[PDB]
Amino acid sequence: DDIYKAAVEQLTEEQKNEFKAAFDIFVLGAEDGCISTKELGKVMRMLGQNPTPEELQEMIDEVDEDGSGTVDFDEFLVMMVRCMKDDSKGKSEEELSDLFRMFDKNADGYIDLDELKIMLQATGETITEDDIEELMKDGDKNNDGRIDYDEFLEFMKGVE
Amino acid sequence: DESERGMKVIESRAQKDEEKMEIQEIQLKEAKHIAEDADRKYEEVARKLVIIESD
Amino acid sequence: DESERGMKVIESRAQKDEEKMEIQEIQLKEAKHIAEDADRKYEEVARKLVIIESD
DSSP, X not given: OOTHHHHHHTSOHHHHHHHHHHHGGGSOSSSOOOOBGGGHHHHHHHTTOOOOHHHHXXXXXXXXXXXXSBOXXXXXXXXXXXXXXXXXXXXXXXXXXXXXXXXXXXXOSEEOHHHHXXXXXXXXXXXXXXXXXXXXXHHOTTOSSSEEHHHHHHHTTTOO | OHHHHHHHHHHHHXXXXXXXXXXXXXXXXXXXXXXXXXXXXXXXXHHHHHHHHHO | OHHHHHXXXXXXXXXXXXXXXHHXXXXXXXXXXXXXXXXXXXXXXXXXXXXHHHO
16 A cells, blocks of 8 residues: 555646545535545546546446445546646656666667666565566566567656 | 426426437447447458468 | 416426426437446457457
């Protein structure tokens, strides 16, 4: 349960406040602060997303993980940090291109799972083969088996 | 009274029809969304087929 | 007559909803036909994806 951190730590106070003020519409008021799933499709539109009815349902399918009928704050801000990146810049392509070259010491055009594994093991944490595959597959949007330069710049955006 | 009862039956019926209609809308939309995903999934496999066929 | 006029608006509404329901019923059998057909095609292409991937 750490994913919410990207969702909140990468926002400026006014960005979090716009997302919350719109989110609070999910409770009528003078109740219990339930925050129902019924207003989720509508709030994504209130905030600037333009989903189709299928997409409105996907937003509902991706929330209410505990079966309560409500949307929590992480579930909502976590989807939005991956949809409407109204972040506190989230650093930049130039900063990440410098890191890319640090990994890609051979100028091969990409970061393979071995370079990815070395940086993570070098961090002091114990890293498994699945842990490196999962980041590679998250960055590898085109399914080419590696994280390339463009994929890398997108991959590490919004990370501290 | 026949016309008023007519309206009560018809209004209730018109509402039943509105509900059956809404139900068909919901159901065709669910079915349509299944179709959006069935078609989307089709596209993913068809696209992957093209990629895999190309490969 | 006013009650019939009300009734005719709601009878007409019931009919508009009957028509929409029928249109929607067609769209449902078609939306679901496609949900199924897209899945039928999913399997035809997905099967080809597997055959072609195996190949």
